């Protein structure tokens, strides 16, 4: 229930398939991490509430709550939660995905796939998007969009 960043694990052996953000009682992760499946939190169960394959986002127990956005100028921080590592902050200046529908910030950071869903933060600590949907430009140089929903 408590706000924060969470590992998404799956059950022999346990594997980390992703990361998500709990905020205002709603769990936020990327759609390709869970494919919309229900999640367990302690003895409780978290049920999908909203999802969108095109945005590659899903929320549990409530509507999408994150609405901060990159200002287009300042450095941000990827709060990466890699499998088997403690959460760590990676500061970077985002690149830009230029699209027909406008510009999207993007971070040229390449972490293991179980880090998908890790939040990208602004200088005030607000989540401006989630990590792990993007493109490869040349020889596994992965660039992730800063993927944010609509509150």
């Amino acid at each position: 229930t408590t706000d924060g960043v969470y590992r998404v694990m799956t059950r022999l052996g346990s594997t980390q398939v992703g990361v998500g953000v709990m905020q205002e009682g709603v769990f936020h992760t990327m759609w390709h991490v869970t494919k919309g499946a229900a999640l367990r939190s302690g003895e409780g169960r978290l049920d999908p509430y909203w999802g969108d394959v095109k945005q590659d986002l899903v929320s549990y127990c409530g509507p999408w709550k994150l609405d901060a956005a990159w200002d287009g100028l300042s450095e941000v921080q990827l709060l990466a939660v890699p499998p088997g590592e403690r959460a760590k902050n990676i500061q970077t200046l985002p690149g830009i995905f230029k699209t027909k529908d406008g510009d999207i910030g993007a971070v040229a950071l390449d972490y293991p796939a179980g880090t998908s869903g890790s939040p990208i933060l602004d200088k005030s600590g607000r989540v401006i998007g989630l990590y792990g949907n993007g493109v490869v430009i040349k020889n596994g140089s992965y660039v992730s969009a800063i993927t944010q929903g609509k509150r």
Partner: protein, 39 residues
């Protein structure tokens, strides 16, 4: 069979590790959520 475990607070960490480029890329986004490069 999927469960969540808390991993930390959501906080900016002053004087954190800094890395990464800032490429500017023309991209297209299709219905499947897939980004692709465009020229």
């Amino acid at each position: 069979d999927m469960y969540i475990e808390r991993a930390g607070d959501i906080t900016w960490e002053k004087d954190a590790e800094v890395t990464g480029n800032s490429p500017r890329l023309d991209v297209a986004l299709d219905e499947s959520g897939d980004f692709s490069l465009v020229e």
